[PDB]
Amino acid sequence: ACGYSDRVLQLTLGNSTITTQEAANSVVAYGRWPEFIRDDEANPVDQPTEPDVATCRFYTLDTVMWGKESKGWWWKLPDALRDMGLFGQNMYYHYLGRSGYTVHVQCNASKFHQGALGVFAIPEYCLAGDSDKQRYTSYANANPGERGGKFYSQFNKDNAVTSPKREFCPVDYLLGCGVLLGNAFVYPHQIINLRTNNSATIVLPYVNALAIDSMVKHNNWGIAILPLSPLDFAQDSSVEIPITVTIAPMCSEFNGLRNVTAPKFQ
């Protein structure tokens, strides 16, 4: 009754509120809302830290631009958030951490623009690399933080055997991992088709083979955004619109407190 709609949503977490007048409903990954570790699934015996409102709130990442040559962007979680306020601090002062996430992807344009974004939430998103060398992508390169990474239209093998880049080489139609992109829809996802919606909203549970793990060593979820249909507008060959990713940690708890982990990102 009254006037409510699938298209108009408000999300509020901590001191942060998101509104959207053009949503395409919202997704809860695998039908599971985020939750805390139960006493009968618990494994570290020490009393956990649950920072709640100070970490479970909306951190907005650096905006990326979508243009006619854009092949796709990717991020890993918790890595994208490693430097985000008190979440980052909690993540680095503890050996163990688990968290769920509300992911909100933002991309508005106009009734006369054209294009479609495939937004995918992938459990354990292992990506392919540079080389003849197998499993050789370095920690620093595997983890771009907030900045994220990109996809490529084809496989350019890093040839310099003497000083190797130890980077990923994510090819778009192969979802950067040896499979076909068309099948990535078996993953939790939404589509931002510009004639239909401004944004995508996916709620991610903590997914792992363990109740809790090292956030610094291992990413639980990968966010992949690919242009399923290319951006276009009127007849202007060089159109460009922004894509903004805003993410919130959910039901975050941490175990194993000690001195701070300072990773070497150089």
């Binding site: 354990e124 690399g129 499993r135 050789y136 920690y139 997914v207 083979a209 291992h218 300072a262």
Partner: protein, 279 residues
């Protein structure tokens, strides 16, 4: 009763209910039946998904390894008088791809061993029937340097003594993972580089690799002392998952495997050429 739903008799429609229209942007797949868009009769459905159950899909013994071992006179250069295999479903492609439709798994594992042998050389006399020892060596246990050193005493390690010609050897193994489920995919590292580290070798790991030795090794030898003439044998290992459970579906591997990780190298062109308006 495991049969699929009966088709309902469906008539003509002139209404404001429009099941044919939808919006895939939502993330959902349209739950449609033929009765939603065409006039249908009543069919009493007897077909069943019995064979596509996770158990039925994996209930088959797959070849995961070929171990070659010789029995000949112990000389002083490199020889195969005993052999060792790192336990894995990844030296082979077929079962690997089936398991990889899923991110995580939990199961008991059945190992069946088919052992074959032959004579190498035209003739130096013959050989009497051979007994083979297959020793499991879990990570940490002493590994053999010699085909008959003390490790083969196998006092605590599990071992099979297979007699040649007998029916293939068979054993079962529990769910032995360190986690609550096996990880078919691990996006991360076993070590982190820290700013305070001396070399930057110290914190370097292989991407997507977890424990160094994962499940240990199988050490195979011929227990018999050598004949005058040489006998070569191969142990083929067949692996079957049983009492299987799986989590989080994944797209199947579409291009050829390039080692233990998700890495591709070439034949990145899986799809054929077909004209848009060509049946």
């Amino acid at each position: 009763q495991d049969s699929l739903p009966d088709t309902k008799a469906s008539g003509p429609a002139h209404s404001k209910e429009v099941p044919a229209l939808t919006a895939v942007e939502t993330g959902a797949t349209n739950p449609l039946a033929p009765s939603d868009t065409v006039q249908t009769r009543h069919v009493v459905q007897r077909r069943s998904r019995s064979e596509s159950t996770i158990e039925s899909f994996f209930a088959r013994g797959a070849c995961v390894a070929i171990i070659e071992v010789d029995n000949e006179q112990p000389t002083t250069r490199a020889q195969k008088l005993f052999a060792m295999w790192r336990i894995t479903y990844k030296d082979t492609v077929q079962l690997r791809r089936k398991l990889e439709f899923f991110t995580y798994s939990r199961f008991d594992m059945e190992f069946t061993f088919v052992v074959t042998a032959n004579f190498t050389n035209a003739n130096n006399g013959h050989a009497l029937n051979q007994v083979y020892q297959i020793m499991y060596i879990p990570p940490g246990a002493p590994t053999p340097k010699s085909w008959d050193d003390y490790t083969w005493q196998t006092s605590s390690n599990p071992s099979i003594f297979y007699t040649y010609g007998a029916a293939p050897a068979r054993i079962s193994v529990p769910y032995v993972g360190l986690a609550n489920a096996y990880s078919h995919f691990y996006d991360g590292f076993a070590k982190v580089p820290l700013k305070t580290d001396a070399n930057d070798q110290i914190g370097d790991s292989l991407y997507s690799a977890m424990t160094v030795d994962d499940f240990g090794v199988l050490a195979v030898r011929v227990v018999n002392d050598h004949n005058p003439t040489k006998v070569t044998s191969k142990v083929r290992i067949y692996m079957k998952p049983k009492h299987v459970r799986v989590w989080c579906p994944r797209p199947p591997r579409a291009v050829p495997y390039y080692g233990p990780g998700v890495d591709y190298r070439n034949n990145l062109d899986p799809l054929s050429e077909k004209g848009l308006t060509t049946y």
